Amino acid sequence: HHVGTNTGGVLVITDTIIVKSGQTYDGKGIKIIAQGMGDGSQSENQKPIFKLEKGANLKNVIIGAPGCDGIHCYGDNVVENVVWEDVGEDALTVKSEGVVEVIGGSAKEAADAVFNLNAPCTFKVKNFTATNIGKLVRQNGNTTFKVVIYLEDVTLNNVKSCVAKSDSPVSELWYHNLNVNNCKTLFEFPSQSQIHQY
Ligand SMILES: O=C(O)[C@H]1O[C@H](O[C@@H]2[C@H](O)[C@@H](O)[C@@H](O[C@@H]3[C@H](O)[C@@H](O)[C@@H](O)O[C@@H]3C(=O)O)O[C@@H]2C(=O)O)[C@H](O)[C@@H](O)[C@H]1O
Ligand SMILES: [Ca+2]
Ligand SMILES: [Ca+2]
Ligand SMILES: [Ca+2]
Ligand SMILES: [Ca+2]
């Protein structure tokens, strides 16, 4: 474990960090605290900490409270070793179509959803821990476009609502090495046959 070279620093920001297409923002272990961008409550008018344009990547940051509106992903994004110390309204939202992968890192203290999927996408969560959350993944309510979710080597503890919820019959969830402790229900999809192991 080579600790990142910005470890121990705290970057205080006052606007959304925009990562452009083809860029990788590498925080090298920096912790970010946002000011004037929200309080991390359930209010829907907060700003995202990061906006990842299509084809942009993000790695090696710790997002401190307040989590605001977390990370907005416009598709074809890799989000690697990001730690949400205290999720805000939500941790990450898929805002436009593409593949989005969350690999490594962890999330704690999500009052509602950790990941909100608001456009058709392929959404993978890999080597990830979350504790004290309402839901790990929510396809935006009452939408019927298709998402495909993969949960691979995911460990969850204290899930108040469910692991994942969608109102879309054509969406699917696939999981592989999923460990869940203390959860109300695992999956709230129209039918349980939308959920698969692999
Ligand atoms: O991208 C967003 O932040 C998203 O937030 C709202 O929607 C989510 C979710 O997609 C909705 O189904 C709805 O969730 C239900 C309740 O309102 C919520 O408080 C909780 O009890 O879970 C419910 C459920 O999962 O069905 O509201 C969610 C929310 O409050 O964050 C916005 O409505 C949506 O437009 C978008 O901004
Ligand atoms: Ca909410
Ligand atoms: Ca919301
Ligand atoms: Ca949100
Ligand atoms: Ca929180």
The CA 198 to ligand 5 mean position distance, Å, reads 32
Experimental method: X-ray
Could you give the CA distance from residue 7 to residue 42 in angstroms, rounded to a whole number? 29
Q: Where are the domains of the chain?
A: 1-198
What's the burial of 2, exposed, middle or buried (CB within 10 Å: 0-12/13-18/19+)? exposed
Q: Beta partners for 71?
A: 50, 92
Q: How far is the CA of 110 from the centre of ligand 3 (A)?
A: 11
- For ligand 1, say whether the CB of 167 is within 6 Å of any of its atoms: no
Ligand 4 centroid–CA 90 distance in Å is: 5
The Å distance, Cα 164 to ligand 1 centre, comes to 13
Q: Where are the beta strands (DSSP E) in the chain?
A: 10-13, 17-19, 24-34, 50-52, 57-63, 71-73, 77-80, 83-84, 92-94, 98-103, 106-117, 121-139, 147-165, 172-188, 195-197
Quick check: CB of 80 below 6 Å from ligand 1?
Answer: no
Closest ligand 1 atom to the C-alpha of 141? 12
Q: CA–CA separation, 166 vs 6, rounded Å?
A: 38
Which residue's alpha carbon is nearest to atom 20 within ligand 1? 112
Residue 72 near residue 96 (C-beta atoms within 8 A): no
Check if 166 has its Cβ closer than 6 Å to any atom of ligand 1.
Answer: no
Breaks (C-N over 2.5 A) in the chain follow: none
Q: Which ligand is nearest to the CA of 70?
A: 4
Q: What is the DSSP string of 105-157?
A: -EEEEEEEEEEEE-SSEEEEEEEEEEEEEEEEEEEPTT--S-EEEEEEEEEEE
Q: What is the resolution of this structure in A?
A: 1.5
Query: Does 1-198 carry CATH code 2.160.20.10?
Result: yes
SS3 193: helix
Query: Is the CB of residue 81 below 6 angstroms from any atom belonging to ligand 1?
Result: no
| Contact between 60 and 40 (Cβ < 8 Å) | no
- Per DSSP, the three-state class of 20 is coil
Are 168 and 192 in contact by the 8 Å Cβ rule? The answer is no
Cα gap 74→60, rounded to integer Å: 19
Q: Answer whether 46 contacts ligand 1 (Cβ < 6 A).
A: no
Taking the centre of ligand 2 as the mean of its atom positions, its distance from the CA of residue 9, in whole angstroms, is 30
Tally of CB atoms within 10 A around 10:
11
